[PDB]
Amino acid sequence: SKRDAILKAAVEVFGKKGYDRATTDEIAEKAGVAKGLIFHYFKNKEELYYQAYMSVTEKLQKEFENFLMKNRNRDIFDFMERWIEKKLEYSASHPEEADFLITLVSVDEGLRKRILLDLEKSQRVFFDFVREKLKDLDLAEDVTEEIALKFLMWFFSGFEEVYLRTYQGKPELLKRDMNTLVEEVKVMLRILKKGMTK
Amino acid sequence: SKRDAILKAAVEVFGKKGYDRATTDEIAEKAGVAKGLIFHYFKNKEELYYQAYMSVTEKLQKEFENFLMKNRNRDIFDFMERWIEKKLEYSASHPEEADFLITLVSVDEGLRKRILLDLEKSQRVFFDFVREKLKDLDLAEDVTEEIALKFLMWFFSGFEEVYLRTYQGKPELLKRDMNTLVEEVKVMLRILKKGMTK
Numbered sequence A, B: 001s002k003r004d005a006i007l008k009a010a011v012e013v014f015g016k017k018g019y020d021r022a023t024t025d026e027i028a029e030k031a032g033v034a035k036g037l038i039f040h041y042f043k044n045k046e047e048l049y050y051q052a053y054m055s056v057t058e059k060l061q062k063e064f065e066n067f068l069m070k071n072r073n074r075d076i077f078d079f080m081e082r083w084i085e086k087k088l089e090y091s092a093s094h095p096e097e098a099d100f101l102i103t104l105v106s107v108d109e110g111l112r113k114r115i116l117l118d119l120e121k122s123q124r125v126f127f128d129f130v131r132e133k134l135k136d137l138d139l140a141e142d143v144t145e146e147i148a149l150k151f152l153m154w155f156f157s158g159f160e161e162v163y164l165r166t167y168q169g170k171p172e173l174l175k176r177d178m179n180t181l182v183e184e185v186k187v188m189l190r191i192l193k194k195g196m197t198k
């Protein structure tokens, strides 16, 4: 469908050039459609970006729910390591999508806040699953639930920052590093498990 | 001295308004000196910012070296927790300086890179002290020196990001939270110690 081709082109072009410098015309020629056809489907550039962004994050969210159904009984450290492994695999296999998602930090303030608010409406869910899994554990002395959860969420939140800093626009480098990043994530989560639990 | 008054005014105004929106004229009236007197001492706004920034980081660096002379025999987790405690104390007592330092992320690219390079010329030192202290320890199974060091440096590097996100421009809130942040840093470093070592 033409709408899907436009969305796919938008992911590619926004991810290569950034929000500000990408144009709807570039997206339209990349999708192989007429320049006005963007505006048939999408009110403007902002809504094009937003719909692309929501399209990608929805697909990801469905994958996370499938994974969650299948790994819910693992302890949280194992669960999180496995999910991070999946995101690392997704990023190496869909570099343009990953490059697309990280352009959010340089989107216009109004659109960016709008999207950051939408994303919180799944992050506060995961956050709560983490909190619940934490109650299943016998926590080490002085390790409160609030500290365990802060620290784990800060660890998890650092995925995007590493990506932006090191792998954005470098698909070959991430492919080269993928298995080693997985190996390091496992050790770091084992460090946190051993330190947080009795 | 007039130069010191200008530098102090620059810290205050750059920290309140940001690099881009601050003017030398604002700085000059804040310092109580003539508008041209800035340019007697400082070639331009960029050099004014740079000299202010180097003035603050130098003072901090001297404090870090004093601390290092006095705490070098502590293990690294204790050493780092104590240094973080000092920076938290410095930030609560010098909010305007802390607000000043965090404006670096929104400085013009050329000046920002220049300063980020200068700061690396002390961060690579601390980094190496951390590496050396790590060799004194018996590391836990699979915890390599490179992983221990990556993880600890990422932990330590998160100070500035929390500040920017939560305490920039909110001196009362940081004062309110200071002792609790210290208490949480201690537990987090104890988590890392227990997990990283045998």
Ligand SMILES: CCCCCCCCO
Pocket (backbone or CB within 6 Å): A084, A155, A156, A157, A158, A159, A162, A185, B150, B151, B154
């Ligand atoms: C900067 C090296 C350590 C970053 C670990 C990233 C956490 C994975 O979510």
Ligand SMILES: CCCCCCCCO
Pocket (backbone or CB within 6 Å): A088, A091, A158, A159, A160, A162, A163, A167, A174, A181, A184, A185, B150
């Ligand atoms: C694509 C980058 C995210 C993975 C972060 C894991 C870093 C551990 O060294």
Ligand SMILES: CCCCCCCCO
Pocket (backbone or CB within 6 Å): A150, A151, A154, B084, B155, B156, B157, B158, B159, B162, B185
């Ligand atoms: C976002 C809550 C955890 C941040 C811990 C910050 C590390 C202190 O350098």
Ligand SMILES: CCCCCCCCO
Pocket (backbone or CB within 6 Å): A150, B088, B091, B158, B159, B160, B162, B163, B167, B174, B181, B184, B185
């Ligand atoms: C001024 C903010 C830096 C302190 C970060 C410690 C966060 C632990 O909750």
